[PDB]
Amino acid sequence: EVQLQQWGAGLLKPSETLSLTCAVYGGSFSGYYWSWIRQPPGKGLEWIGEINHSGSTNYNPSLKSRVTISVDTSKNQFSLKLSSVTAADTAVYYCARGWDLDYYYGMDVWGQGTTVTVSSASTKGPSVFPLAPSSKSGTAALGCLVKDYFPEPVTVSWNSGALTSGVHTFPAVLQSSGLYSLSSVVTVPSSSLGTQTYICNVNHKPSNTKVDKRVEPKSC
Amino acid sequence: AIRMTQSPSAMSASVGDRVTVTCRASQGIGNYLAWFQLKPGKVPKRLIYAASSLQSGVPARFSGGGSGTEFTLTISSLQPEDFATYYCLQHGFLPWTFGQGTKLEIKRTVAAPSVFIFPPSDEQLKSGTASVVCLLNNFYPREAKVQWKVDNALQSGNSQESVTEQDSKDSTYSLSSTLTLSKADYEKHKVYACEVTHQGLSSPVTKSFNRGE
Amino acid sequence: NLCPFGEVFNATRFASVYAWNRKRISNCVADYSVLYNSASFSTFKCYGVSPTKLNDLCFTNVYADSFVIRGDEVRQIAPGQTGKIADYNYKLPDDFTGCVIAWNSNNLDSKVGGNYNYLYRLFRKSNLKPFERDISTEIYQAGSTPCNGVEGFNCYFPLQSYGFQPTNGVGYQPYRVVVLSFELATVC
Ligand SMILES: *[C@@H]1O[C@H](CO)[C@@H](O[C@@H]2O[C@H](CO)[C@@H](O)[C@H](O)[C@H]2NC(C)=O)[C@H](O)[C@H]1NC(C)=O
Numbered sequence: 001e002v003q004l005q006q007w008g009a010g011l012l013k014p015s016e017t018l019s020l021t022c023a024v025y026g027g028s029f030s031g032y033y034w035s036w037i038r039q040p041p042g043k044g045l046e047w048i049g050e051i052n053h054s055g056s057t058n059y060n061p062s063l064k065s066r067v068t069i070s071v072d073t074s075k076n077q078f079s080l081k082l083s084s085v086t087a088a089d090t091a092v093y094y095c096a097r098g099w100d101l102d103y104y105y106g107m108d109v110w111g112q113g114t115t116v117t118v119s120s121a122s123t124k125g126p127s128v129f130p131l132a133p134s135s136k137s138g139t140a141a142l143g144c145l146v147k148d149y150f151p152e153p154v155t156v157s158w159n160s161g162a163l164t165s166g167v168h169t170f171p172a173v174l175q176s177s178g179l180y181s182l183s184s185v186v187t188v189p190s191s192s193l194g195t196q197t198y199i200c201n202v203n204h205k206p207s208n209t210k211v212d213k214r215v216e217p218k219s220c
Numbered sequence: 221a222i223r224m225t226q227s228p229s230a231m232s233a234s235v236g237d238r239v240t241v242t243c244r245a246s247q248g249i250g251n252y253l254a255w256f257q258l259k260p261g262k263v264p265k266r267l268i269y270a271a272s273s274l275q276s277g278v279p280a281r282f283s284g285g286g287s288g289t290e291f292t293l294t295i296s297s298l299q300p301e302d303f304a305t306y307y308c309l310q311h312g313f314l315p316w317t318f319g320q321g322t323k324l325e326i327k328r329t330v331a332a333p334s335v336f337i338f339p340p341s342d343e344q345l346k347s348g349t350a351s352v353v354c355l356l357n358n359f360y361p362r363e364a365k366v367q368w369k370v371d372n373a374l375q376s377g378n379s380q381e382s383v384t385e386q387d388s389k390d391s392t393y394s395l396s397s398t399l400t401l402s403k404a405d406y407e408k409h410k411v412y413a414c415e416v417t418h419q420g421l422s423s424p425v426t427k428s429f430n431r432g433e
Numbered sequence: 434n435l436c437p438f439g440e441v442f443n444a445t446r447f448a449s450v451y452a453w454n455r456k457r458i459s460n461c462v463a464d465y466s467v468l469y470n471s472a473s474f475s476t477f478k479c480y481g482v483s484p485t486k487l488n489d490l491c492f493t494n495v496y497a498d499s500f501v502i503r504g505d506e507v508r509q510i511a512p513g514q515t516g517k518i519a520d521y522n523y524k525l526p527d528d529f530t531g532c533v534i535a536w537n538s539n540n541l542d543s544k545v546g547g548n549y550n551y552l553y554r555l556f557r558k559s560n561l562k563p564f565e566r567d568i569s570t571e572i573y574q575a576g577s578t579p580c581n582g583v584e585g586f587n588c589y590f591p592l593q594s595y596g597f598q599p600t601n602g603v604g605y606q607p608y609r610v611v612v613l614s615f616e617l618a619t620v621c
Binding site: 037044045046047058059060061062094099103104105106107108110111112113127129130131132134139141143145147168170171172173175181182183185187220 | 252254256258263264265266269270273275307309311314315316317318319320321334336337338340341343344347351353355357380381382383384394396398400429433
């Protein structure tokens with residue numbers, strides 16, 4: 001019925017300028033404000049700004065005049081420019097159909113979103129370290145620590161996907177160095193430590209990196 | 221400028237319960253209050269506009285109302301497809317401001333975690349950094365306090381944590397706390413301990429190891 | 434003898450749109466072309482009559498309605514328009530033969546922390562009739578539950594304030610509006 005398709009580069013270095021564009025295909029482009037919303041990772045939603053068919057803009061004061069919102073009335077598009085970006089601007093940016101000009105309610109339709117990550121880090125493959133089951137135990141636990149990688153994501157399977165029960169792959173955590181760190185864990189019966197083999201399958205497509213790591217009990 | 225206080229921050233419920241989240245406005249925003257649903261990976265969708273009006277295509281169990289200053293989103297008979305995070309938005313006065321959210325999670329019985337501790341591998345020590353990983357598994361109450369003790373010295377400021385979403389089967393969480401330390405600092409100490417405080421444990425359980433054993 | 438248009442356009446204070454001010458004008462000799470050519474009006478649209486001053490010195494009773502709204506609502510001060518201002522605050526008839534003048538007033542009606550003095554009717558059970566003026570502060574019943582003059586759940590105060598900060602976009606900045614109507618007894 002009405003669809004919004006947005007695009008733009010999402011991998012920026014600090015001090016660069018984020019430039020996203022949204023295209024409207026459906027509802028009268030004149031009778032609505034067109035807005036940008038932001039959602040930092042695990043930090044709730046924040047309203048950036050908006051523009052109407054006549055070019056009037058409302059901006060969020062939180063951005064220190066770093067925001068510029070433009071409109072192209074001959075292509076039914078509107079764009080977002082954010083200068084002097086920092087890692088604090090890392091978020092998912094949505095474009096949306098804002099308020100109408102009759103009774104002033106909106107946020108009806110949303111773009112698919114653009115993931116934007118601001119980091120001065122270079123692409124790096126992860127190092128994979130074992131989390132060995134201790135000399136203890138019922139049920140035991142083992143896994144892999146996937147550290148020092150940029151950017152996201154990494155995909156972790158166990159025994160080439162042959163085992164999925166009890167697996168827990170934790171969401172990545174941004175270390176203070178600017179690299180990501182993740183941990184994947186399995187609970188397995190402690191009577192299976194000597195007979196069954198457990199191997200990490202870690203894939204990092206950005207660096208074209210594959211690491212297979214066998215996880216065994218550490219000998220005393 | 222306008223503060224939108226959303227309560228509670230998080231709440232547990234089960235299918236079929238009646239649920240109301242509240243959004244309290246700093247000033248009178250009249251009828252300019254929207255409610256949005258938000259799920260991991262999915263684009264946010266509008267639920268309520270103008271405080272009380274229902275977005276087309278949204279089921280009838282979703283209701284809304286307001287006073288200009290205190291607003292309320294209500295689900296009559298909760299369904300599985302409603303376990304998400306709900307946000308309110310005022311557009312009464314510029315700048316438009318959101319609430320902090322209300323996460324709606326599945327209720328189940330109390331489940332004590334299983335705790336495991338993992339020393340740093342020799343291979344990682346060769347690189348010069350040590351990572352000690354503590355794992356909490358299969359617990360329903362999200363409230364969990366993990367404390368690192370290095371030779372009985374309470375470690376803070378070098379511990380990063382991470383938690384999964386509610387499992388699609390048993391509806392539990394699992395948590396990983398990683399303590400990061402330089403190789404030199406690691407070899408300066410003997411006992412590495414992970415103390416876990418959780419509702420399902422009558423006493424705080426401690427999993428530990430001794431460097432070298 | 435030269436008309437008191439100064440007292441309307443130049444007026445130090447303007448009215449909230451819901452309580453729009455109406456000035457009668459008679460014994461009036463006015464140059465209407467001099468107003469139409471003034472760059473100080475962003476908006477000057479005459480429906481039906483059109484700008485001309487040879488029309489009888491003044492009609493039987495020239496009415497000057499004045500008030501403040503925001504930028505995006507200026508288009509609603511016009512015949513046949515629908516919107517919150519035209520439904521609930523100030524309506525013009527379809528057979529309207531008069532002029533609508535507007536200008537941006539961000540410098541006069543905007544405070545740094547927000548000028549909350551200009552208000553508009555936000556709720557009403559029915560659409561206004563043309564040239565109707567509703568001052569009712571009756572608690573509006575939005576839901577099925579009555580209000581009994583007490584605010585509460587789905588029980589609103591019927592008037593909402595504009596924010597009017599200078600940092601607002603042009604669409605949300607205050608605009609002063611003057612609507613001149615001409616009616617034709619005797620002629621001045
Ligand atoms: C609103 O106020 C302005 C300024 O007082 C008036 O503009 C003046 O108009 C006279 C002619 O009538 C000129 O000779 C002056 O030079 C104008 N001053 C400026 C600075 O523009 C204006 O006339 C007033 N509005 C009305 C309807 O009288």
